[PDB]
Amino acid sequence: DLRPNPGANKRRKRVGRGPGSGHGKTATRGHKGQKSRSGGLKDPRRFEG
RNA sequence: UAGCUGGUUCUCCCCGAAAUGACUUUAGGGUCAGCCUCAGGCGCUGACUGGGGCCUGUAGAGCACUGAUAGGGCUAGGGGGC
Ligand SMILES: [Mg+2]
Ligand SMILES: [Mg+2]
Ligand SMILES: [Mg+2]
Ligand SMILES: [Mg+2]
Ligand SMILES: [Mg+2]
Ligand SMILES: [Mg+2]
Ligand SMILES: [Mg+2]
Ligand SMILES: [Mg+2]
Ligand SMILES: [Mg+2]
Ligand SMILES: [Mg+2]
Ligand SMILES: [Mg+2]
Ligand SMILES: [Mg+2]
Ligand SMILES: [Mg+2]
Ligand SMILES: [Mg+2]
Ligand SMILES: [Mg+2]
Ligand SMILES: [Mg+2]
Ligand SMILES: [Mg+2]
Ligand SMILES: [Mg+2]
Ligand SMILES: [Mg+2]
Ligand SMILES: [Mg+2]
Structure with missing residues (x-):
């Protein structure tokens, strides 16, 4: 078991x-407009x- | 500071509004409700439809109330004439 694949398990979606x-x-970006x-x-x- | 104007950059997939109400030194802004979406939960209830009960005062009509109204009759009152 090594640094190749110890990744965040099936969650923690750091994607803002x-x-x-x-x-x-x-355009209007998010709910605006x-x-x-x-x-x-x-x-x-x-x-x- | 700007409840104003402008501008806001890659892709595919699902759903999909509102321009109404209330209050607002409020009226091209807001808060709550309405309508959109996602998650978890309930599970035949939902729109629409059949049957039945109750609530209603519009269309139409009517003159019984409130008023309006043409002609005639009968008839107080007033007007002209003997
Ligand atoms: Mg980015
Ligand atoms: Mg969009
Ligand atoms: Mg400001
Ligand atoms: Mg504008
Ligand atoms: Mg950017
Ligand atoms: Mg997206
Ligand atoms: Mg969807
Ligand atoms: Mg569609
Ligand atoms: Mg009031
Ligand atoms: Mg506007
Ligand atoms: Mg304003
Ligand atoms: Mg709201
Ligand atoms: Mg059912
Ligand atoms: Mg009746
Ligand atoms: Mg009528
Ligand atoms: Mg009668
Ligand atoms: Mg009457
Ligand atoms: Mg009376
Ligand atoms: Mg007579
Ligand atoms: Mg008389």
């Missing part, structure tokens, strides 16, 4: 999502309306 591309999450979508939104937790 990349929303810059021409397919999948794209409108406005007040830029630096941040006010909360909600407590804050808002």
Whole structure:
């Protein structure tokens, strides 16, 4: 048993999502596509309306 | 700082919206609900349909109520004439 194949067993999918591309999450990048979508939104937790 | 404008880069596969309601110094922004999706759980219930019961005041019609209305009759009131 050696370093060739001691790999992460059948999980731990370190693959984050990349929303810059021409397919999948794209252009608008992730759930956006409108406005007040830029630096941040006010909360909600407590804050808002 | 910018609740505004612009821009956001490889591939294939499955599903697939909304542009409504409530509140908002709210109205091209938001929070909750509605609608989308994924995971786990329940498992014949779901849309649609057959049979039966109850709830209803629209279309149409009607003048019994509330009002409107043409002609005639009968008839207080008022008007003209003896
Ligand atoms: Mg990346
Ligand atoms: Mg990128
Ligand atoms: Mg994807
Ligand atoms: Mg997409
Ligand atoms: Mg815009
Ligand atoms: Mg818009
Ligand atoms: Mg901001
Ligand atoms: Mg799918
Ligand atoms: Mg389809
Ligand atoms: Mg109210
Ligand atoms: Mg605004
Ligand atoms: Mg919401
Ligand atoms: Mg069934
Ligand atoms: Mg009736
Ligand atoms: Mg009618
Ligand atoms: Mg009668
Ligand atoms: Mg009457
Ligand atoms: Mg009365
Ligand atoms: Mg008479
Ligand atoms: Mg008289």
